[PDB]
Amino acid sequence: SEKEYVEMLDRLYSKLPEKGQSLPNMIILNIGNTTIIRNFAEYCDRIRREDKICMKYLLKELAAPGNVDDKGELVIQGKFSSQVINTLMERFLKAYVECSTCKSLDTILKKEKKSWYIVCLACGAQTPVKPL
Amino acid sequence: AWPKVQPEVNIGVVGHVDHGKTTLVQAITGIWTSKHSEELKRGMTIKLGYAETNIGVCESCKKPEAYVTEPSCKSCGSDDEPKFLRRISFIDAPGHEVLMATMLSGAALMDGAILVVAANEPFPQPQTREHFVALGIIGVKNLIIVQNKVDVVSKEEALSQYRQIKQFTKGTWAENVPIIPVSALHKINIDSLIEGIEEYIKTPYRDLSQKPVMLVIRSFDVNKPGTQFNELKGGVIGGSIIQGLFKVDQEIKVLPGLRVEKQGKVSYEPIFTKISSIRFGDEEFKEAKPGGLVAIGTYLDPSLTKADNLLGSIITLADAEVPVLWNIRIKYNLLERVVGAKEMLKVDPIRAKETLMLSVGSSTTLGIVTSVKKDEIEVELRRPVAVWSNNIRTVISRQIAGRWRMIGWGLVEI
Amino acid sequence: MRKVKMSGLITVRTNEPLGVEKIKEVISKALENIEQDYESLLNIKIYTIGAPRYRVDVVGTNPKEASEALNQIISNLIKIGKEENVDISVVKK
Numbered sequence: 001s002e003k004e005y006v007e008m009l010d011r012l013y014s015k016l017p018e019k020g021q022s023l024p025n026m027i028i029l030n031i032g033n034t035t036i037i038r039n040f041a042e043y044c045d046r047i048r049r050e051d052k053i054c055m056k057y058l059l060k061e062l063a064a065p066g067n068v069d070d071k072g073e074l075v076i077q078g079k080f081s082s083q084v085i086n087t088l089m090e091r092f093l094k095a096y097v098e099c100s101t102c103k104s105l106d107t108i109l110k111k112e113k114k115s116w117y118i119v120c121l122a123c124g125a126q127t128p129v130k131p132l
Numbered sequence: 133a134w135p136k137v138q139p140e141v142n143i144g145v146v147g148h149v150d151h152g153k154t155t156l157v158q159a160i161t162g163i164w165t166s167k168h169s170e171e172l173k174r175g176m177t178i179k180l181g182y183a184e185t186n187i188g189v190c191e192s193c194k195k196p197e198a199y200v201t202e203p204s205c206k207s208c209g210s211d212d213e214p215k216f217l218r219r220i221s222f223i224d225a226p227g228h229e230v231l232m233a234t235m236l237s238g239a240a241l242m243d244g245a246i247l248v249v250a251a252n253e254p255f256p257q258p259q260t261r262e263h264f265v266a267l268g269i270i271g272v273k274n275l276i277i278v279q280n281k282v283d284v285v286s287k288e289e290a291l292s293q294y295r296q297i298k299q300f301t302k303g304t305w306a307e308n309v310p311i312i313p314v315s316a317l318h319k320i321n322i323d324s325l326i327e328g329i330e331e332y333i334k335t336p337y338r339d340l341s342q343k344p345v346m347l348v349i350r351s352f353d354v355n356k357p358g359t360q361f362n363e364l365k366g367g368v369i370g371g372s373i374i375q376g377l378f379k380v381d382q383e384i385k386v387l388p389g390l391r392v393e394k395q396g397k398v399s400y401e402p403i404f405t406k407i408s409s410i411r412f413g414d415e416e417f418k419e420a421k422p423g424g425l426v427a428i429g430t431y432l433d434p435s436l437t438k439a440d441n442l443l444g445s446i447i448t449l450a451d452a453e454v455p456v457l458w459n460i461r462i463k464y465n466l467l468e469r470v471v472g473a474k475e476m477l478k479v480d481p482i483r484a485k486e487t488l489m490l491s492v493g494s495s496t497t498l499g500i501v502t503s504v505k506k507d508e509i510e511v512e513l514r515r516p517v518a519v520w521s522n523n524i525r526t527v528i529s530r531q532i533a534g535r536w537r538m539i540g541w542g543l544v545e546i
Numbered sequence: 547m548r549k550v551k552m553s554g555l556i557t558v559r560t561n562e563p564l565g566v567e568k569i570k571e572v573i574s575k576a577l578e579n580i581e582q583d584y585e586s587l588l589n590i591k592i593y594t595i596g597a598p599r600y601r602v603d604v605v606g607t608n609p610k611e612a613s614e615a616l617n618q619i620i621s622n623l624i625k626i627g628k629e630e631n632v633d634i635s636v637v638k639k
């Protein structure tokens with residue numbers, strides 16, 4: 001019953017992460033004592049990274065609290081300068097998204113008991129990263 | 133509100149090496165099994181992984197997006213609570229050619245399994261094949277062939293192989309087995325698998341009247357260092373009840389038991405003890421039955437169990453009939469070629485006095501051929517083996533290139 | 547300004563059907579009357595450090611009386627234990 005099979009086959013495919021890119025400029029603003037990244041969701045979305053993760057990292061580095069909009073926006077409970085955000089953000093890219101072998105930024109992020117790995121969709125290599 | 137119940141069936145996960153059969157076991161249970169790590173401690177001293185999960189269903193959603201693993205039901209865009217179906221546990225098997233003898237041991241705990249098969253490599257691989265026919269011999273009928281890592285292969289390809297995995301299947305005991313293609317890494321089509329194992333591997337009937345019999349694959353000392361003298365726990369034997377059932381405050385015995393060679397020949401005399409407690413994962417019970425790795429806390433001196441000592445043994449009701457033999461007759465059947473090798477070469481005849489490795493339950497032992505008729509041989513086992521019932525199955529391996537290889541099986545004639 | 551630590555490593559191994567159980571006994575007997583006859587041993591505490599290895603802790607008001615009873619305990623563990631098929635020898639320390 002290839003039919004049965006093929007049916008499931010096609011289903012996984014259309015469940016994949018698209019096919020194969022500057023980085024959208026991360027829009028940031030201020031409202032009292034908050035810094036808000038309008039597209040924190042889209043941004044993360046286009047680097048194949050979970051929001052909680054960029055959030056956790058970016059927040060930890062900031063030493064500030066915050067969560068995400070119901071409409072994918074980052075509300076950092078602290079008014080920080082647009083600049084430092086980027087500085088800490090690129091650092092996030094370097095350590096958790098960029099491939100060591102070729103620097104693609106076109107990667108996945110495995111996880112196992114206590115070892116996470118960056119997985120390049122181009123070169124195919126795995127940069128082991130400090131699970132955090 | 134779901135029931136805290138013990139495993140119902142044991143589904144092992146077999147296959148080659150690097151083929152994802154661990155990433156998969158968690159792409160299901162959501163648990164990372166230590167089969168792939170170095171452990172200096174209590175417990176596992178063999179490369180075997182374990183992973184329990186619950187299996188519910190939301191009769192409010194559609195298949196396969198229907199089945200869940202947690203009480204919740206968000207995973208289908210609904211809320212009408214899903215009904216608890218069963219509770220299953222996977223045995224994580226070592227796909228490495230060397231380690232093969234510790235697979236045949238995980239198999240003797242297997243109830244039904246899944247044969248993982250990578251899409252990017254040619255089919256079938258050495259252990260992919262070996263492991264397969266291993267299942268055949270040991271006695272499993274429930275088999276689902278998982279097609280993994282397609283998220284790195286062309287649809288045009290995943291199909292190409294599909295065809296083969298199938299023709300390979302004709303005439304085999306699993307001639308009409310499923311082939312649920314997935315992506316354990318991306319955790320995609322896992323639900324289609326959960327419907328598969330729900331559809332093709334169903335809890336078997338447990339004759340709870342037979343003689344209680346458990347296969348041991350580990351042992352340890354629980355007591356932390358320092359523990360006062362009054363909070364000391366007896367040894368803990370772990371494994372799987374393979375038939376019947378035991379319950380607390382009972383009368384059990386471990387075989388062959390304690391070795392005793394004093395002033396003559398050596399001999400193994402049973403280790404008698406009472407069951408101190410029962411546990412499946414983090415939940416304590418009052419009786420253990422087939423399905424799931426058990427933890428039978430006993431009463432004996434922790435020394436006896438502390439080093440995965442009692443692995444390769446069996447636990448029985450103190451009062452039972454279980455011959456611990458040194459010499460055994462076996463109506464063996466040899467194989468075609470040496471599956472699991474590379475140089476497809478025929479299996480030479482069991483010559484007398486030749487040495488062979490015999491798998492028999494959680495146990496593994498070497499012996500020397502003393503008789504060699506048409507379809508029956510007799511062997512001298514260095515360590516005796518406890519045969520819980522006449523004509524139990526045994527796998528026969530023969531070291532070939534410094535490496536041990538499977539060449540047959542037989543029935544142990546008590 | 548009262549306590550005085552007095553420990554020592556021992557070996558305890560049995561094959562009795564109720565292992566830990568016979569161990570519980572011998573101790574909870576060989577360790578009887580000590581805190582009472584030869585008295586103010588502020589406290590007594592036998593425990594396990596590893597596998598067949600164990601230790602005994604005797605803190606008293608005077609060191610001379612410390613090893614006084616500590617020996618009387620071990621003295622009896624060996625004896626009583628051998629009276630119940632409990633094999634316990636000593637690794638003085």
Ligand SMILES: Nc1nc2c(ncn2[C@@H]2O[C@H](COP(=O)(O)OP(=O)(O)O)[C@@H](O)[C@H]2O)c(=O)[nH]1
Binds near residue numbers: 148152156281282316
């Ligand atoms: N792309 C991809 N990699 C996978 C998949 N499943 C497992 N892997 C990776 O391939 C390797 C083998 O997986 P492992 O779980 O250790 O399987 P084992 O070797 O059979 O016991 C690891 O690098 C996994 O992260 C899958 O579906 N897709």
Ligand SMILES: [Zn+2]
Binds near residue numbers: 100102122
């Ligand atoms: Zn790369």
